[PDB]
């Protein structure tokens, strides 16, 4: 049996430091995709 | 399960009181409930004091819980091998002269969200008398 | 939480004791012979624990917290105080309710 909190397991990301990142990172995709362009994230399309 | 207070039943003002409950029947160690003190002055309502538990999560290595009034002047402890309560009360009163009890707080302690919430004392003590005079 | 101040009742008859600051569900009822140490009749509003009589049942309408004693008898005359957990986890306890079933 469990005991103590009723939750389902989680993952912490920190916002900032993420963006951060992902600023960065996206900048280096537009040193092939050009200068300027339009860059969408989304989650997994399906599978396993 | 039996709960039996034990300590000085005389105690001088401005002192130190100490008292000492001992289970029967039952382990300490069990995250099934609190464990701690209700004292109830003479002639006068019920007073909740405060309770402890080792049972933590993982930010904390225990709970333990004061009344915002008493905080500072309490302090509370728990024995888990030997089964034992404990309750210090630095700088007493007259004021402080009541019929203390060892009590024991039943609640959403096995179960929680968040924080462990005890809500009522289900197994009470005998109690004994303390008066505080100077 | 503010409890009536007394409460009386002949032997057979129904009483209903109030309570009333109680927000929450974790309401819990005692009963204190004088002399004697206090004792849970009732927990989690009309929940009742083991050794004790189907006459003792709790109720809780918006604010206001009930508990009532049906079947009235000798051993039913001490003081009744109620108490609830409030916010986090502090629990706090009314001034109690003295019911006498004396003849």
């Known amino acids: 049996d469990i005991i103590g909190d009723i939750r389902q397991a989680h993952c912490n990301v920190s916002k900032a430091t993420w963006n951060e990142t992902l600023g960065k990172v996206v900048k280096q995709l537009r040193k092939h995709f050009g200068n300027n362009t339009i860059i969408r994230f989304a989650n997994s399309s399906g599978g396993d | 399960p039996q709960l039996q207070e034990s300590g000085p039943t005389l105690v001088e003002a401005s002192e130190t009181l100490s008292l000492t409950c001992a289970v029967s029947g039952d382990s300490t160690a069990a995250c099934n409930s609190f464990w701690g003190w209700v004292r109830q002055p003479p002639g006068k309502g019920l007073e909740w004091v405060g309770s402890l538990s080792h049972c933590a999560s993982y930010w904390n290595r225990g709970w333990t819980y004061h009344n915002p009034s008493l905080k500072s002047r309490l302090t509370l402890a728990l024995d888990t091998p030997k089964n034992l309560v404990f309750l210090k009360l630095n700088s007493v009163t007259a004021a402080d002269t009541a019929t203390y009890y060892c009590?024991?707080?039943?609640?959403?302690?096995?179960?929680?969200?968040?924080?462990?919430?005890?809500?009522?004392?289900?197994?009470w003590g005998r109690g004994t008398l303390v008066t505080v005079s100077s | 939480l503010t409890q009536p101040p007394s409460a009386s009742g002949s032997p057979g008859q129904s009483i209903t004791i109030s309570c009333t600051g109680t927000?929450?569900?974790?309401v819990s009822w005692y009963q204190q012979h004088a002399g004697k140490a206090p004792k849970l009749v009732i927990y989690d509003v009309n929940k009742r624990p083991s050794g004790v009589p189907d006459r003792f049942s709790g109720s809780k309408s918006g604010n206001t917290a009930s508990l009532t004693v049906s079947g009235l008898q000798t051993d039913d005359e001490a003081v009744y105080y109620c108490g609830s957990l409030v916010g986090n986890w502090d629990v706090i306890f009314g001034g109690g309710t003295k019911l006498t079933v004396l003849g």
């Open positions: 009590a024991r707080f039943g609640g959403e302690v096995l179960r929680y969200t968040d924080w462990p919430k005890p809500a009522w004392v289900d197994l």
């Open positions: 927000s929450n569900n974790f």
